[PDB]
Ligand binder design. Structure first.
Ligand SMILES: [Y+2]
Ligand SMILES: [Zn+2]
Length: 312
């Protein structure tokens, strides 16, 4: 178990393989692709009907796009634990099929363990020689959404580098392929990040509302509310709202915006808690990991329920 520590990439990976092997009648692990460096990228597919009954919408949750945000992956694997290992909300398996990608960017995650704790990009290089020095691209700037128009830098060494082109990163292409393959029945998309205790929705490039703003801000407020009553007295309150207006700046190329631009009705970027305003924020004290994973699961429960209502 040990949700008492931030686990290594191999541990997270081995966990999906454990769920896949132990509960094959409800879970299926798929090795999407290979990261830039050769590491397998994996997600797990949970369904009590083998993804066959298309009348059941899909819930897609992912984390680990940003290497340094360590609290992100365990929140995703805790959802996997709650969906397969300790099912206390049976209606969630009845009503939906699920896809969870704990770590979208494995080369960057591992690298925060082996080399630099606060690296955020991927670890790719390209025909351009300067990429030998400046590796990777900001994954949450890589999606084809007004790509590179704002919130980025053309320097391959910037941490907000958008990549050589939209979806130039295989890690980002994996998320894309999931969105499209399940677009028809995807009721909700949650991409987990850190930190700020925030639940953000499109649009991130200009801070304007989308046609589905009412539902977005209603289900968020409802998720943020259940978190709050399950949270620890010392944690800050959740802020719900438009991504750009809450986060304070404009960003082009996010996965949340991209997912919304192609039709996913409810798509949010969850900025999990941090207790220090600086780099320390990306390292919520370990003793809190199981708590943040637990409360965040209560948010996911309310949000998947509300999203199911609004999808029908
Ligand atoms: Y460095
Ligand atoms: Zn992030």
């Amino acid at each position: 178990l040990p949700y008492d520590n931030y686990q290594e990439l191999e541990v997270i990976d081995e966990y999906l393989d454990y769920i896949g092997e132990k509960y094959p009648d409800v879970a299926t692990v798929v090795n999407a692709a290979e990261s830039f460096e050769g590491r397998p990228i994996k997600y797990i597919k949970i369904s009590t009907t083998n993804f066959e009954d298309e009348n059941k919408p899909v819930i897609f949750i992912d984390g680990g796009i940003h290497a340094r945000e360590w609290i992100s992956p365990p929140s995703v694997t805790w959802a996997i634990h709650k969906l397969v290992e300790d099912v206390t909300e049976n209606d969630l398996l009845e009503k939906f099929d699920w896809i969870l990608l704990p770590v979208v960017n494995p080369d960057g995650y591992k690298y925060t363990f082996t080399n630099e704790r606060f690296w955020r990009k991927t670890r790719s290089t390209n025909n351009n020689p300067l990429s030998q020095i400046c590796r990777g691209a900001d994954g949450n700037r890589n999606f084809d959404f007004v790509w590179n128009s704002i919130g980025t830098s053309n320097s391959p060494c910037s941490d907000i580098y958008a990549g050589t082109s939209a979806f130039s990163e295989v890690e980002t292409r994996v998320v894309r392929d999931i969105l499209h393959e399940h677009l028809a029945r995807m009721a909700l998309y949650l991409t987990m990040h850190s930190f700020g205790s925030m639940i953000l929705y499109p649009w991130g490039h200009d801070g304007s509302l989308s046609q589905n703003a009412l539902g977005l801000h209603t289900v968020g407020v409802a998720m943020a509310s259940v978190i709050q009553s399950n949270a620890l007295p010392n944690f800050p309150p959740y802020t719900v709202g438009n991504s750009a207006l809450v986060i304070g700046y404009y960003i082009a190329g996010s996965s949340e915006d991209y997912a919304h631009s192609i039709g996913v009705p409810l798509s949010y970027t969850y900025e999990l808690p941090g207790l220090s305003s600086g780099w320390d924020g990306f390292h919520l004290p370990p003793q809190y990991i199981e708590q943040v994973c637990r409360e965040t699961w209560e948010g996911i429960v309310v949000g998947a329920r509300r999203a199911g209502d609004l999808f029908r």
